[PDB]
Amino acid sequence: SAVKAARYGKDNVRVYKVHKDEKTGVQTVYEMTVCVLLEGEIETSYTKADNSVIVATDSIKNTIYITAKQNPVTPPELFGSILGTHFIEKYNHIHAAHVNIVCHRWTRMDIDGKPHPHSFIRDSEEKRNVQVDVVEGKGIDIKSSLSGLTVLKSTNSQFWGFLRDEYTTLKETWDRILSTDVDATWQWKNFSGLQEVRSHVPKFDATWATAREVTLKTFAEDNSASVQATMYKMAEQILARQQLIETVEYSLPNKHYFEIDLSWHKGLQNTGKNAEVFAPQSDPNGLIKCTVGRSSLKSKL
Amino acid sequence: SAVKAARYGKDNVRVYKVHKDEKTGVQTVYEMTVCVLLEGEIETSYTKADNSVIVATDSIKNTIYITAKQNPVTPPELFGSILGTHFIEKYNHIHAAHVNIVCHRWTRMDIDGKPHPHSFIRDSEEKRNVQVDVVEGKGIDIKSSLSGLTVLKSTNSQFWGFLRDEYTTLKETWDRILSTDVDATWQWKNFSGLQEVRSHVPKFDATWATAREVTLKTFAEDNSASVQATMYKMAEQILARQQLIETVEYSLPNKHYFEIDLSWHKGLQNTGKNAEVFAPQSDPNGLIKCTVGRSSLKSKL
Amino acid sequence: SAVKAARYGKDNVRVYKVHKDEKTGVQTVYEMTVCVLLEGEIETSYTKADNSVIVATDSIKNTIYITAKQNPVTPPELFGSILGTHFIEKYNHIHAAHVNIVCHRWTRMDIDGKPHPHSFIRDSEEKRNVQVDVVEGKGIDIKSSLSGLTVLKSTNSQFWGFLRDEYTTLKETWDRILSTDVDATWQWKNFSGLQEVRSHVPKFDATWATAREVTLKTFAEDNSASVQATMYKMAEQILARQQLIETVEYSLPNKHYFEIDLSWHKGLQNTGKNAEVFAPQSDPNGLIKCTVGRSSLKSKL
Amino acid sequence: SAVKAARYGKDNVRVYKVHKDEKTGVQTVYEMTVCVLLEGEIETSYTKADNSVIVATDSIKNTIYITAKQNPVTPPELFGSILGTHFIEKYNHIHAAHVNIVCHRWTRMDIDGKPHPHSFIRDSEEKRNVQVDVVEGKGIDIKSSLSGLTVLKSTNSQFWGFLRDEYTTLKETWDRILSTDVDATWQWKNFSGLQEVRSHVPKFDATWATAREVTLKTFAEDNSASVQATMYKMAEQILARQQLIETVEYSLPNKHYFEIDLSWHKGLQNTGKNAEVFAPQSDPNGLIKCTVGRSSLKSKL
Ligand SMILES: CN1C(=O)N[C@@]2(OO)C(=O)NC(=O)N=C12
Ligand SMILES: CN1C(=O)N[C@@]2(OO)C(=O)NC(=O)N=C12
Ligand SMILES: CN1C(=O)N[C@@]2(OO)C(=O)NC(=O)N=C12
Ligand SMILES: CN1C(=O)N[C@@]2(OO)C(=O)NC(=O)N=C12
DSSP states (O other): OEEEEEEEEEEEEEEEEEEEOTTTOOEEEEEEEEEEEEEESOHHHHHSOOGGGOBOHHHHHHHHHHHHHHSOOOSHHHHHHHHHHHHHHHOTTEEEEEEEEEEEOOEEEEETTEEEEEEEEOOOSOEEEEEEEEETTSOEEEEEEEEEEEEEESSSBOBOSOBOSTTOOOOOBSSOOEEEEEEEEEEEOOBSSHHHHHHTHHHHHHHHHHHHHHHHHHHHHOOBSOHHHHHHHHHHHHHHHOTTEEEEEEEEEEOOEEEOOOTTTTTOOOSGGGOOEEEEOOSOEEEEEEEEEOOOOOSOO | OEEEEEEEEEEEEEEEEEEEOTTTOOEEEEEEEEEEEEEESOHHHHHSOOGGGOBOHHHHHHHHHHHHHHSOOOSHHHHHHHHHHHHHHHOTTEEEEEEEEEEEOOEEEEETTEEEEEEEEOOOSOEEEEEEEEETTSOEEEEEEEEEEEEEESSSBOBOSOBOSTTOOOOOBSSOOEEEEEEEEEEEOOBSSHHHHHHTHHHHHHHHHHHHHHHHHHHHHOOBSOHHHHHHHHHHHHHHHOTTEEEEEEEEEEOOEEEOOOTTTTTOOOSGGGOOEEEEOOSOEEEEEEEEEOOOOOSOO | OEEEEEEEEEEEEEEEEEEEOTTTOOEEEEEEEEEEEEEESOHHHHHSOOGGGOBOHHHHHHHHHHHHHHSOOOSHHHHHHHHHHHHHHHOTTEEEEEEEEEEEOOEEEEETTEEEEEEEEOOOSOEEEEEEEEETTSOEEEEEEEEEEEEEESSSBOBOSOBOSTTOOOOOBSSOOEEEEEEEEEEEOOBSSHHHHHHTHHHHHHHHHHHHHHHHHHHHHOOBSOHHHHHHHHHHHHHHHOTTEEEEEEEEEEOOEEEOOOTTTTTOOOSGGGOOEEEEOOSOEEEEEEEEEOOOOOSOO | OEEEEEEEEEEEEEEEEEEEOTTTOOEEEEEEEEEEEEEESOHHHHHSOOGGGOBOHHHHHHHHHHHHHHSOOOSHHHHHHHHHHHHHHHOTTEEEEEEEEEEEOOEEEEETTEEEEEEEEOOOSOEEEEEEEEETTSOEEEEEEEEEEEEEESSSBOBOSOBOSTTOOOOOBSSOOEEEEEEEEEEEOOBSSHHHHHHTHHHHHHHHHHHHHHHHHHHHHOOBSOHHHHHHHHHHHHHHHOTTEEEEEEEEEEOOEEEOOOTTTTTOOOSGGGOOEEEEOOSOEEEEEEEEEOOOOOSOO
16 A cells, blocks of 8 residues: 555634724634645655654644734734645655644624724624645635525525426426525636735735625625526626636525415415415425636637 | 323514615515514313313414514514504413514615615624513513623733632633623513503614623723622613613623743743733633622612 | 522543452442532632632542542442532531532443353443432432433334424324433432431432333334323322332433334325335434422312 | 526424334334425526426425435435436436435344344434435535544644744643544545446445544554644545545534643642643634645656
């Protein structure tokens, strides 16, 4: 036998950091969950009981906290790049570091109409994430995402004109509920190293904000022909607004809300135009995915 | 043997309802999870295989949807009272109905600064709940609550002066993080029936809003001596603002954020006044409870 | 305002303990999650910022580990009684201790047909639990339970003869699937203190084993008229087998498995006698409860 | 813009099937959760609101149930291959079907020492899974796995000789607890189509049993130098026992159990040779991965 692939490290590292402005009194908090997995000349730890090549996962954990003490933790694209770069530079035999960060929301409270200096609310379980792959000799590849953004619209969603054959029971509809949990990812151009990442730092928060804004406005305003059609519009708009993005990926569940025929009870009308009470379905669910990039077709368009 | 207690029914009934204003185009959505458990002269279903006394849980489910079609689903205190009253009135042999409702957030989206007519966001997993016990001959007992309201403050929390003995290792502190998930319950005066509940309908939304406002402002502004002291202030204020409440209960976890001593690494200072990076602890957690009512002591105060 | 009720302590305390037989080499492991909440003369911690009356939750945590080091952790009824007794004896002003323990399964592995001396498998997420309320001057009240025991039978379950009215759509059935997650609790006679608990120690493991055995055999062998009828048989048998039990409580979800009519597709027959493929329903679910004790009726039986 | 990748379908489809032997009375149950995602000439559903190319996810759901009615659902490798093959054969424009199946345990109960004909227990949340990718013109690629197999050994685990530098605090140990949740995957040789899969049907259950047996015996018997070293031994043995496997992958968390120094309390000794009570850590956790295949090095071995 031989090792074909290997990576190892510390997962589920919870990290909080506070910034305190001693002049103004305003404090700002950041909370995340971090995973760092390393690759390199480590195969003998598996094949030969050679622990000398292992940077202990406990030490990886220590390093995450040390790095958060010595550097900004925002934007997460930057923090992940600093962290990953550290491992490949510090350890000759480590050649890749894979850093995943989930950022948790702590939104400043407004009390009596004024932003409070040191009190926060988890205003959504929506996350902002990064995946930062730092690969020695091949730069830094970053995928940024938002996830867990749960939305519903009560009309202005349709689904008709789909294939009908002997497996089909679904009724066409011209007016349905649409609800999803948005997972949207934007994949950056490869960066050559930490200097190039740093040169683009403002673009990270700006692109996350654009992606969120586009997602919400397109969901709310598109008289949707399908999940497929709506999500494509989102992606095309994000690509148009940040040239340093190469692709946008969406993964959207179709969280079904079924009509309930009550006509068996006193002739109650609760379908079609009279549908008011619905049964949210926990499972199953449609699951619709696509990855959109910029076009390069020049004929047969 | 004999049956000492029994109740049965349908749990985990997911319910959506939409209201459509055909004049304005504005739609409003409501989503909940409902449980109804019944008591009464049912013991022979357990002891004698006598199914004649069972109103099937499937029929209870149907009834929940029918009741939502025929009545408002808001405030949940009212919906639960209507639902519970139905079972004790419809079925001679059913003498109590226990209705639990969890209300899920669907907050209207603002798009380009304007409220959208039919698009919503799950802006928090915080819930608004009710427990409505309708007991034939003994009226309607309602407990209202908010839960899953997750908050953090980065300073203005203290914990010193606690008992110290041979089991104690905890350091006193004059400046710590405080974070919790608020579960707050207000227990209404017994209502004689559905008419009395209906007579107080505006008070339900108003009291929920007061409880939330008080919770947030007191958390944010109290330079807290302990979870105990802060939660008591919340409760006393809610009682002062609604005379139809008899008690207020809080159940608060103390979600610990530990300092991380980094002085072993290059003399890094990350404790006390220099604490910036902390380790959120998933478990264990303090858990602090109290039920506050109005005083009746007249001496030894 | 005044404090009507209060309790506080440490929740979610994970505890492992190993026993090592140095003669035989056999090791035995125990893992639990513990909660201890205290009551007593503590109201001034809430009303007056008086921390002097607080035994810190951190110290409660320390105490749990110390108590596990100095005493057996099995049976959990005993461990909980020792732990609770400690708080009311050690602290004059603490008058009740409420100890909840969840015991996690670590079943010894059999390797090549032989029990291994130090390797274990989590063979089920089923739990064994206790609730031990130690109340100064009023002894020790113990509720023991098993929970998370998930079972299914594919036939020999029926449900017919239930009430039918204008809310009813359910078809009677003479052959259905029955599946549940068993939560069964046996409530012990009050014990006067720790000596009386210790005097009954073998009965704890024996009664847990009886309750489990009865549950499984009755589920498997009863040609069930309803969940109600089957669960009552379980309870009556457990009561008959341990006189120091006062009541047995069951709480059982009815985890529905729906037939799927496929006759629209090529005349496929998948209902009634030809039902082979079913749709497990995640929600909603029936929920059936009862508490059974011994009879005291002497006429009208 | 243009669609670079797309797939869609139905996720979280719960499926039960029963087999009834009418001669013997013995019934056998199967329960799974299925996901099917399709690829093909579908881009216009995203770009052009062209629903004609969409086989509705509702119809995919119907098809899963129909296929389970008309075919064996075991082994899951076979069921997934039949299901995936159906979509690429039935629909000219669909060119890949990605079928994921999670199989849930329903183990036959033994009652009074005899296997019961129709009663089952969920004896573990361990799963048996498949990932079956059916790609038109490129056969069928199958990855089989077991997951959620949670184990602990109380001794015969070590971790010493790891890299030590200025980021390291971890103590070397010659005797520790090792606990994990095993996720093990074996990747089959590409199959040319459904006939080739069918030709190997007995190997699926046999290889799953081998993988489980090897996992448990190696975990229990290896005096482990590290998670890395132990998992490699597992993989090499599985490869040696099934030549139609190309690779074996393990992904193992290191679920830490920390010693608790109690020497501050009455000189209690609970570390090193006297360690009996430990604190299971929920997070963070090591995470150790590798993919093992057969060797092709002929020099520098
Ligand atoms: C109702 N429905 C389907 O049956 N398939 C679809 O995904 O769930 C699909 O392909 N697109 C939809 O928007 N709606 C759907
Ligand atoms: C740090 N700490 C404790 O150790 N016990 C306490 O609850 O967690 C307590 O009783 N009250 C607190 O506010 N803080 C605590
Ligand atoms: C099918 N079904 C019901 O509709 N109600 C019942 O609980 O779920 C009930 O009261 N008892 C049952 O055993 N079966 C049921
Ligand atoms: C204690 N410990 C580490 O600190 N890193 C390791 O994974 O968690 C590692 O690389 N291998 C181990 O077996 N044990 C570990």
